[PDB]
Design a protein around this ligand. Structure first.
Ligand SMILES: [Ca+2]
Ligand SMILES: [Ca+2]
Ligand SMILES: [Ca+2]
Ligand SMILES: [Ca+2]
Ligand SMILES: [Mn+2]
Ligand SMILES: [Mn+2]
Ligand SMILES: [Mn+2]
Ligand SMILES: [Mn+2]
Lengths: 237, 237, 237, 237
């Protein structure tokens, strides 16, 4: 199976798989059962922003999410990612719906990774920033129901012609280039990601969420990963 | 055939195809016969640096090359690249040798492209920086004789075990991700590239040169493009 | 007197000093009488974005301005800025009103300057980005009526408690650090600036405009530079 | 007195003030008596590179130092800098010698600070990079014996005409612009710094070291802070 590290914006509480009884943000290391969560006061229909940061010296994966006019939510987990992920990875965004649903619209996505070696300073870096997504966004690998270009946005899950979100949907977008997160000569490795999202639902119970993830380069959507599995995991182990 | 825009660091004067009678830097638009050249005082065995810049407002492709302790050489050509290249391209480095030879070693390579739309500011960007190249540089598409990892460098053309450059060699490295240089909503598009190189030869007449190029995404080395054709063009038209 | 290079967003046509008979964007080199202008379809009450770019190889100062859902306006002028400005400068934003008035609100401002020498690659750079302005923005030198912190914005000219713009006002904001735009070893120098603005007026004839400018480090608002002089020039010569 | 946070590259072991019995890297919070140290295999006459990183979510100040062909040394300390430093600070480099001496040459210095608010994404940033220092580096506040321009470098402490380091010297360089490290709306604040240095001595016992520091904006060299006090502290408390 794939190897997944993710920060989840989980909109629907699945208490039998360890979710708290409210929408939450979480850090997922090879399991949908988060290693750490924090309460997230998700706002239906408002544009929010999530930030994810990590470096190989501190070995702490941290995330912060907020909305304008509102307090933030944050979560952190101590994990050496070089012991979890391979040296080369792909990065992406994933989202899903099940019998409960919501739009999983991405309005912007940015990412910066750095590998500093011991050669004279010696910086190696990758950076990308999307503030619009066109109909043929060639530097994105779209998987499942993910589409780009509708209103210049990235719609991770299926949305009908009228704008209504559909249930039983799963979609992901991965940056085309592989990303180097470890090197034998690296003295410090770091990454930061930011994305802005619009989660909207006609219902009082939206589902299922959006995640920023890092995976083996050949990662694909696991069979049956709609709903609670967020398009990331093949089961709830 | 491929569509090529390139800045050439041409070390060997081929006067019958329009080269001046000395090493030179040139701007190549769909032909090895440069649209513009400038004299280049190439130094055998020294590390040099080339810079390339362009934006869609000014529509002028410019380049500067220098060595420490030395004056620079520069060349510019007015060209609307949106009338030459497709909307999506790949960027790369190419080099060749023929009966005359030289090492075509790249020590660093950086690139930044930006597409600013008319939406609130609205920046879209790609940036990469290589200051080392490992044995398995997965974000580089290596073509021909190009290799990475020998002394942490990118060797565009073949070098023997002892370090001697080989003749009749051609190699290229392209960044893995496609690059977006035009968009219908873009109000300004720009790119800048920098690379550091070491051209060394045991001979008084090194050949053939190194080029930074932009091409259709599916670009490949043209058959018979060793020597004077710089791994970029199928003929000298 | 000060030495000023500016890109003006001129909202009021002063035909006796060479302005065209409509709102326009212009490039100003040591005079309020622009060396080059282009028609600007200014929209009262909408947030717009201006971009300014320049490099020492091409020696062309260019600007583009737009609004969402609208076409852009652009202007360019060939000028070697090293022949106009001193080696060290300050950069800023200026605005004014006269008997006619408007708000001159800045919502964001970013700037990047680079000096690349001939030493191994050798990059020198300054970058700043403001997306909010607090009450005590210590890295900004505020001049005249300029204030920060009202709604997290930079108000270049005076606005009343109720939000109405006031006439006969002039204000500027300069970044605190001096900026290096030339060096004897520089092989390429470049700068880019972006700002987002909101110009609103209760009147059918707003005045007078906003400009991005570059000046001697000790630049101050010239006496009597309200209205048509944009807080930049001491007279209309 | 000033408020100082610093990462010290301490070349001389002063055991009575808590230094370990070997050259070391340390994190200093309001005292020359480091809160945390690690052994540093300092190499006389070789160019080395230090990296410093911090963010307000993790609240961990970390540093790594290395030389080409050598292993790194690293140190980390959990500290909420918003509880130590004021909201606005200046950043700089400091160095000293006493009866024992060394050159404290800086070859490059870069710094990036970011304040991300909860407004739509909302990035605020400062970045500077020096790869050369000229004779009149106006964006640097030089203090004490610090000079720029000799071989394009920043010499923190006094060096004679012949190149010999002098004892009883203290010098600092601070970036001219104040830096904003906290804001009421900031959801994440971060900074990273890098500098390359050349510490050389004719003696088997070099002294005293170089530090990257953050201080109140009006920070000045404390009286009698030569030698073991690194130009940062007024005493050894
Ligand atoms: Ca759930
Ligand atoms: Ca040739
Ligand atoms: Ca006017
Ligand atoms: Ca000591
Ligand atoms: Mn969950
Ligand atoms: Mn040629
Ligand atoms: Mn005008
Ligand atoms: Mn110590």
């Amino acid at each position: 199976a794939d190897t997944i590290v993710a920060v989840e914006l989980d909109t629907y509480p699945n208490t039998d798989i360890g979710d708290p009884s409210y929408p939450h943000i979480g850090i997922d290391i090879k399991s949908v059962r988060s290693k750490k969560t924090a309460k997230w006061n998700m706002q239906n229909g408002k544009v929010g922003t999530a930030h994810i940061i990590y470096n190989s010296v501190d070995k702490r994966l941290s995330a912060v999410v907020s909305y304008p006019n509102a307090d933030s939510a944050t979560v952190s987990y101590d994990v050496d990612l070089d012991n979890v992920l391979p040296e080369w990875v792909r990065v992406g965004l994933s989202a899903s719906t099940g019998l409960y649903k919501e739009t999983n619209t991405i309005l912007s996505w940015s990412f910066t990774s750095k590998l500093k070696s011991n050669s004279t300073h010696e910086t190696n870096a990758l950076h990308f920033m999307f503030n619009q997504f066109s109909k043929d966004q060639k530097d994105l690998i779209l998987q499942g129901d993910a589409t780009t270009g509708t209103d210049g946005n990235l719609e991770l899950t299926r949305v009908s012609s009228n704008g209504s979100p559909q249930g039983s949907s799963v979609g992901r977008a991965l940056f085309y280039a592989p990303v180097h997160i470890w090197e034998s000569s690296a003295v410090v490795a770091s990454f930061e990601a930011t994305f802005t999202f619009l989660i909207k639902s006609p219902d009082s119970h939206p589902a299922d969420g959006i995640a920023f993830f890092i995976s083996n380069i050949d990662s694909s959507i696991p069979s049956g990963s709609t709903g609670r599995l967020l398009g990331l995991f093949p089961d709830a182990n």
